[PDB]
Design a protein around this ligand. Structure first.
Ligand SMILES: CN(CCN1C[C@H](CCCNC(=N)N)N(CCCC2CCCCC2)C1=N)CCn1ccnc1N
Ligand SMILES: NC1=NC[C@H](Cc2ccccc2)N1
Length: 342
């Protein structure tokens, strides 16, 4: 009786039919489906997180943020399907707009025109402006978290690693463990930052811009410290100004121990790129997070002037935990999903 898909249970009630397997990957399993009430095809993601406290924490964060945000460039939650009781609730199904591809899949197979790069970048920054205006950090921006439909609308997804910004509590020691995807990590993550300031998102967007220009990751480090050495290989040795900002001795002395390296010019790395795009790239991939361009300045950059319109770049109406045993986490997920029950 319950709907089955390639061997596993995927019972999304009577409303969602004609399921088609889309993917998997620890985060449960995704299928497209038909929404008999709105008669559009939707995407449905099955989540089975309750067996691990980390999965429940990320599930709760994503649900709470996505339910509060409302923005054209941020994926919404259309519906949440779960059992009527906490005892019977083993999985949760998240219903979202159906998006045909993501930037990761697209960069694997397609070359982007400069007009596409410009428009995709504009929508990323437009969505990020709203996120940061809510005092939220995404913390895992990368091509696979940017969804695209057939008319080139872009929507940011996957807020499971998000945090509320906390700049006064950002400092930490050298080579401190971190969770977000290595290739998109800002250099200060490896040096002295917990990733609690808005500048770590801007770095990631700069990495995404570089990748849209070349179809390959600009800093493809194979391990934690290898990441920093890739960044320094292109940006060159940090200046005295930038090093005086790093007061932790272990991090400072690591950088001082390296042979001097000169900056590789962006136009050597991206010889086909719009020069205005490379000027913005340079400002987003600035070593010093305090000198790095902010989202509202990036939107106002000449590269984006055919789209820039601050009156059409909305902000959140209000600014926006992690110690809970999985049982009250399940209880919190149950409460947060109650509004979708019949
Ligand atoms: C030749 N124009 C660019 C073309 N565009 C695009 C834009 C509409 C895009 C819709 N996008 C959306 N999301 N709805 N618009 C009206 C927005 C006013 C601007 C200019 C004054 C300051 C506030 C922003 C334009 N005139 C250059 C303008 N200009 C001069 C100095 N600096 C800039 N940007
Ligand atoms: N403003 C604006 N609405 C639609 C159109 C989208 C687009 C897509 C690819 C390349 C350029 C532009 N542009």
């Amino acid at each position: 009786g319950p709907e089955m898909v390639r061997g596993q249970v995927f019972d999304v009630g009577p409303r969602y039919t004609n399921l088609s397997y889309i993917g998997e990957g620890a985060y449960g399993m995704v299928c497209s489906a038909y929404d008999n009430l709105n008669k559009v095809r939707v995407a449905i993601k099955k989540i089975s997180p309750f067996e691990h406290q980390t999965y429940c924490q990320r599930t709760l964060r994503e649900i709470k943020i996505l339910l509060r945000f409302r923005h054209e460039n941020i994926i919404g939650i259309n519906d949440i399907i779960r059992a009527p009781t906490i005892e019977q609730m083993k999985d949760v199904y998240i219903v979202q707009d159906l998006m045909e591809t993501d930037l990761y899949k697209l960069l694997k197979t397609q070359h982007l025109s400069n007009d596409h790069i410009c428009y995709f970048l504009y929508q990323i920054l437009r969505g990020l402006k709203y996120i940061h205006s809510a005092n939220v950090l995404h913390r895992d921006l990368k091509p696979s978290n940017l969804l695209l439909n057939t008319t080139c609308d872009l929507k940011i997804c996957d807020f499971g690693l998000a945090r509320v910004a906390d700049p006064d509590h950002d400092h930490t020691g050298f080579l401190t463990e971190y969770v977000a995807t290595r290739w998109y990590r800002a250099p200060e993550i490896m040096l002295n930052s917990k990733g609690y300031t808005k500048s770590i998102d801007i770095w990631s967007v700069g990495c995404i811009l570089a990748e849209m220009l070349s179809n390959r990751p600009i800093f493809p480090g194979k391990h934690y410290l290898d990441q920093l050495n890739h960044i320094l290989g292109i940006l060159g040795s940090p200046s005295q100004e930038d090093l005086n900002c790093i007061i932790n001795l272990k991090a400072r002395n690591y950088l001082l121990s390296l042979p001097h390296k000169n900056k590789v010019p962006w136009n050597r790395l991206f010889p086909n790129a719009d020069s205005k795009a490379l000027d913005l790239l340079d400002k987003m991939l600035t070593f010093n997070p305090h000198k790095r361009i902010e989202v509202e300045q990036a939107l106002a950059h000449p590269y984006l002037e055919q789209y820039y319109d601050p009156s059409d770049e909305p902000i959140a109406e209000a600014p926006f935990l992690d110690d809970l045993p999985k049982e009250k986490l399940k209880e919190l997920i149950f409460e947060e999903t109650a509004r979708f029950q019949p």
